[PDB]
Structures are given as C-alpha cells and as structure tokens.
Nucleic acid binder design. Structure first.
Lengths: 124, 51, 53, 145, 78, 70, 143
RNA sequence: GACGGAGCCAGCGAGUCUAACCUUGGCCGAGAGGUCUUGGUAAUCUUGUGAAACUCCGUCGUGCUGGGGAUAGAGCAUUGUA
C-alpha cells in the first residue's frame, strides 16, 4: 500500500491546506454567517484563548491529547488554527473538555456544550 | 391629531395649534411687537424673509 | 480604578430609566417623555397628556 | 391555444429521472412529482429547454424531454444561475449542484449525516425527536410522532 | 433648538412636571400652591404661588438664590 | 384531471355532431358532458367560435355564455 | 377629435403597446428574462415567457404619461403585491428593483421615457408622441 | 378559487440635536440587501404612505390538485459585542 488515505475538505479545501492557511481565508470560504461574524469584530476575539490554546498544544504530553484550554467564548467559530487542540466550553457550569477535530470547522463552540439535562418526563 | 394608547385599556390624545402671520415690516415695530404682549404658554418664532 | 463594572447598557430594556422612578418596565417612549405607564397615568396632567375624549 | 389532431404520439405514463410521471397534464407540474425539481425549478427547466409551456406530458416528443433530463442534473452547465439551486458551495467538493430525485434527499442525508461527524448542537437537537429551528416544543405540534 | 414641535411641547410638559413635583417636595412647609412658567425675553420666570413666601425670599439674598442655583445647575440653565 | 385534458381525435368530431341543440356551452359545459377539461375546453370553445357553431354573448373566463349559431 | 392615452382605457392600450414594442424590437430584455421573478411579492415566473417585458414597458410608459414622475422604488411599490406568508396573512412588499429599473432604462434608450428632475422619470416628447399615436391606433382598431 | 400580468384606491399615523429616525431619488443585485446622495424637526419631505380585499385578461379544471405551505435543507445577506 502507498496511499495515505485522503483528508476531508471543508468546502473544496482539504485539511493540509486548511490548518496552515489563515483565520481569514477560512472565513472567506466559510458561509455568510461566519463571514459576517469575522467581518465585524476585528478586535482580536480569541485573545487569551489562542495563547493558552497554543501553550497547551505545545504542552501536550507527547502526541497525546493537549491540556484543557477553558473559555466562555461559546460564540467562537472553530478555525483551522486550533485543529488538534483541547477546549473547555461552559454551559451554566461544566467545562466540557472537547477535542477540536479537523472536520469541526466553521461552527460555534457553544454548539459543543449542551446547556441542559434534557427533559425526563417521569424517569424516577 | 396625536393619540396616546396607555394601559383594561386606556387612550389619550392631543393640541398643537400652529399658524403663521407674515408681517413684511420694518424692524422697529417688529422688535416692539415681539417685546410687548408676553404671555404664558404661547411659542412665538420670529424668522425672516421667505427663504 | 475598576475595570469590570459594565455590560453594554447602550441598548436593551436596561438602556434607560423612568426620569421619575428608574423604571425599565411600562416606560412610554412615544415623544420621549420616558415615563412608566402607571406614572404616566398619574403625571399625565403635569406633562399635559390629557384625557380629552 | 388550438385544436390539434394528435395521435399515438400521445403516450401515457413514462419514466424520466428514475420515477414514473403521469401523462396528459402540464409538463411543469408533471416534473414536480419528481423529487428535487420544484415548481420554480421545473417551470424554468420547461422554459430554458425551448419547450412550449402550454403542452401536456402527453405531448413532448423525446428530444425536448431528453434535454429536460440533461438540464436537471446539469444546472449551471445550461445557465441556471446558482441562486436558483438548493445546495450552494456544496460541503465537500464545494461546487453548486442541483441534486435530483434519488440524489437530493441523499445529499440532504449527507448534510444531516455530517452533523454526527461534528458533534454540534444541531445534531444533538435533531436526535431527540425535536425541532432544530429553535421554536418552542411546549405547546404546539401535538400530532407529532 | 432643532427640536420637533411635538417633542418640544412634550419636553415642555416634562419640564413643568419636574417643576410641579420638585417644588411640591421642596416648599411644602411654605404651603406651596403652584408653579407657573412664563418665558419672556431675557427671563424665564418660575412663580411660586405659595402661602409663606417670606421663607422663600431668604435673608437679603438667600434660598431663592439657592433654588435658582439648584435649577440652574441641574437643567444647565445660564 | 378526470379525463380528456388531451383531445383524442373522435371527441372534437363528436362535439361538432353534438353541438346542435346546445343552448348552453362554455368551459364548464365542455367539461360536464363527461368530456374535455378546462384547459382545452377553452381550446374547443375558441375553435368552435373560430367558425360558425357557437356564438358568444358574454365576456371573460370564469363566466361565459356561448350558443348555437341559429 | 384629438386623442391622449388618458383618453384611452388602460388595459387594451397596454396590450396593444406590448405588441407594438414587440414589433419595434428595441427591447433591452437584459438576458435574465423569464428566469427572473419580476416582482418580489410573487412566487412563479411569468406565464408567456416571450415577453412580459413589453407588457411591463407598456404599463410603465402609460403610467408615466399619466403622472409627473415615478421612480425605481415607486415602480417597486406599484408592481409589488401581496405574497402569501403561508401560515400568516398577507403583506405588501416592494417589487424587484432591477426589472422595473431595466424597464426605465429600456424606455429611456428608445426615447419613451427620460430621467426626470426632482428625481423619477418624466414622459418624453417622443414618449408622449408614440403613446398618443398608438393610443389613437388602439382606438381606431376598435372604432 | 390558486397563479401571473394588467387597473391601481384610503384614512388613523410616526418621523433624526447636541444624533443616526422616516426614507424619496439614482444605480447594483432575481432577491435579500448594498451603494450614493436628496427632502423632512414635518399642510412643506418620506407620502398622494399608488394598501390589500377589489377590477380586467387568461394559466388551471376538479385532481391531498397548480388547493394548503407543515417539515426540512443549503447559500446569500441584514439587526446586534454575540
């Protein structure tokens, strides 16, 4: 065998040129919601998060899962800069330790932390 | 005519009475007619040649 | 000397007050008199929003 | 229009785009029996294929129907301007497909399916038998399931 | 100015409301009976029709000074 | 579409042999003789008013009255 | 006796003037004809598919003879309609601004309309000319 | 009665100063929207709010149907720190 299988594509752009491209070219090919999100708010939104994020991605224990990087920015779009890192996402409590996946691109961090224990009609 | 809905509901209204009198006039008796006959409640606006 | 004391209070229901009594609720905003509706009902002669008909 | 005198050229139910289509009614809404080609889309296919709109499905000798077939899985190839489509900037190849009868639901499937690859709250709201468009489940929609 | 006449009259009513409630709270022990607001050239007269206005006039220039000053410094009046 | 949104040759000839004595023909008449639907009922009204047989004395679609040429 | 297009009923004039500008061939039917909605307050594309633009050109031309001026947005406010909000009742929306604006540019190119001062579009002297002329034609075909 | 042209009609109204309201017009875009000015602190301009229900001319023909617009998807954009 010779074929190292393939990478997934975001919208016609594979992962190998996703991670090492930019934030802003990603939000170019990201849809109108993410493009409108990063069109405004140019005042360094993942500020402490990126520094601690890369600090635990570099403090990762030798190709294991990195240390949790905890934030309240539920509204943060997963960008290919943070692929392979570990994010702690709030919901009222409960810092959810989440692996960032290659395929997880384009959507909000608050989509990855459920904010309620669901319904339980009855269920004693 | 202005109307005011207010809360078992409630309604008020209103009365802006606005007119214009044009006195193509010397400035002497304009100054006199604007200093004299002061009165509570009435707004006088003294503007100049129609432009 | 304090850096963490304020949410954006420029819009929302908390963005103003009743000038009599601080109210966000019941606040009349037509013609900007900024009175809550119950104090509007009370001070409507002091401001002059009279019951005419 | 006019009385014409047509013959066994008038043929009833035929299969185009993998499903069966009723004859003797207007081609525009004959094609809306087919999945993925809506009323606007089928209307514009019957316009852009140089087809008389007023005919039935009982008419339409095979060239115009074959060109309609050719249009429906090749939208921007024959100038359908990609605002008139359903799956813009696709999700993997990033192109603009107008997916069809056995494709569109499948590609619809693929959208929902890739949510289970991501773990977003969209799929989480999908799985429990609920509405993902955020409206209340408290009072409305009671014939549900 | 640059005030719409609708908003102008509503704001004048708000001003007379603050006059009435404030001078109600203020000069109640002078037997405050009412204000009236009369703007003339060079003046804007708030008349305190009341029972005991010698306690309003003040010692050879007092509290009517201080009351005009309170109204002055709140309402940004010259 | 119960039947006859196409013309099926013998139908128009049976119309020409069955519009004598029709005091009342219209869209709904050419439907309700167990016959041609309102798409090409208008076509056969236009094509009998094309020559002779039916004469119009009202105006528009949803409401017509056409007669025998007497 | 003398004619005006106010002196003629509107609908038969607009049919005759649609057929007249069909005869003319001075069109500007930009290229997105019948792939377009022609009014945002509607769903389906127009039914004739060769034209609807001469109909709308006739309507805009006679409506500009009868008025001082109308704008792009005024024609959007005119040819807009009540589109169904489905589970909710109806509401009026401005039409597609492109289509009406291209009708204005088309009638400007022929000299049937002219960009008005104060904003809007006045009927041109050739516009008044051609409208009253084939309005006289539309009466004398019904004489 | 749907659908599109085509005629195109009100009254009660609200509208921006020590700011960002009504928006005309003109373009660009199917659109959404955007652009640029323009007027109106309002019998002045938005606005004559050219509203729909309505009127004509047909596409439909009695068919969960072209009635009905539930679901749902993806894209485009606007509101807003989100």
């Amino acid at each position: 065998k010779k074929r190292v299988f393939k990478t997934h594509s975001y919208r016609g752009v594979d992962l190998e040129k996703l991670l090492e491209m930019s934030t802003e070219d990603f939000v170019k090919l990201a849809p109108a919601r993410v493009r409108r999100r990063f069109a405004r708010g140019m005042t360094s939104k993942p500020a402490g998060f990126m520094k601690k994020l890369r600090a635990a991605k570099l403090a990762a224990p030798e190709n294991e899962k990195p240390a949790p990087v905890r934030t309240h920015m539920r509204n943060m779009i997963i960008v290919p800069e943070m692929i392979g890192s570990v994010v702690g996402i709030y919901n009222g409590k409960a810092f959810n330790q989440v692996e960032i996946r290659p395929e997880m691109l384009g959507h909000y961090l608050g989509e990855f932390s459920i904010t309620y224990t669901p319904v339980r009609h009855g269920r004693a | 005519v202005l109307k005011i809905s207010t809360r078992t509901w409630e309604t008020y209204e209103m009365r802006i009475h606005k007119r214009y009198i044009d006195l193509e006039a010397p400035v002497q008796i304009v100054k006199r007619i604007t200093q004299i006959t002061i009165e509570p409640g009435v707004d006088v606006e003294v503007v100049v040649a129609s432009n | 000397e304090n850096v963490w004391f304020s949410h954006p209070r420029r819009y929302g229901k908390g963005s103003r007050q009743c000038r009599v009594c601080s109210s966000h609720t019941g606040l009349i905003r037509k013609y900007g008199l900024n009175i809550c509706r119950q104090c509007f009902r009370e001070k409507a002669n002091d401001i002059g929003f009279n019951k005419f008909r | 229009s006019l009385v014409v005198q047509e013959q066994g050229s008038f043929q009833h139910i035929l299969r185009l785009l993998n499903t069966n289509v009723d004859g003797n009614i207007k081609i525009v809404y004959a094609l809306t029996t087919i999945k993925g080609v809506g009323r606007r889309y089928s209307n514009l296919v019957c316009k852009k294929a140089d087809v008389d709109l007023h005919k039935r499905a009982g008419e339409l000798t095979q060239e115009e129907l074959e060109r309609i077939v050719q249009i429906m899985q090749n939208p921007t190839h024959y100038k359908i301007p990609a605002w008139f489509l359903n799956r813009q900037n696709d999700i993997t190849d990033g192109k603009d497909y107008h997916t069809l009868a056995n494709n569109v639901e499948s590609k619809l499937r693929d959208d929902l399916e890739r949510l289970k690859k991501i773990r977003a709250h969209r799929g989480i709201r999908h799985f429990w038998g609920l509405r993902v468009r955020g409206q209340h489940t408290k009072t409305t929609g009671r014939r549900r399931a | 100015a640059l005030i719409s006449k609708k908003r102008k009259l509503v704001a004048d009513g708000v001003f007379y409301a603050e006059l009435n409630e404030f001078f109600t709270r203020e000069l109640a022990e002078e037997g405050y009976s009412g204000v009236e607001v009369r703007v003339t050239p060079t003046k804007t007269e708030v008349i305190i029709r009341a029972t005991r206005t010698q306690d309003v006039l003040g010692e050879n220039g007092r509290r009517i000074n201080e009351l005009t000053l309170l109204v002055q410094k709140r309402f940004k009046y010259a | 579409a119960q039947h006859a949104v196409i013309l099926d040759q013998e139908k128009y000839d049976r119309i020409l042999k069955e519009v004598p004595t029709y005091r009342y023909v219209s869209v709904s008449v050419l439907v309700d003789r167990l016959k041609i639907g309102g798409s090409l009922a208008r076509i056969a009204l236009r094509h009998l008013e094309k020559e002779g047989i039916i004469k119009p004395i009202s105006k528009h679609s949803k409401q017509a009255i056409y007669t025998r040429a007497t | 006796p003398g004619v005006s297009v106010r002196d003629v009923a509107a609908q038969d004039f607009i049919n005759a003037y649609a057929s007249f500008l069909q005869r003319q061939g001075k069109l500007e039917v930009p290229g997105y004809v019948d792939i377009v909605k022609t009014s945002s307050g509607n769903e389906m594309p127009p039914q004739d598919a060769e034209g609807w633009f001469y109909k709308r050109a006739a309507s805009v031309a006679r409506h500009i003879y009868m008025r001082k001026q109308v704008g792009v947005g005024k024609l959007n406010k005119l040819y807009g309609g009540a589109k169904s909000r489905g589970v909710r009742p109806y509401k009026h929306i401005d039409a597609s601004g492109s289509i009406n604006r291209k009708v204005l540019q088309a009638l400007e190119k022929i000299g049937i309309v002219e960009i008005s001062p104060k904003g809007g579009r006045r009927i041109s002297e050739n516009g008044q000319r051609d409208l009253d002329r084939i309005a006289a034609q539309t009466l004398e075909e019904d004489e």
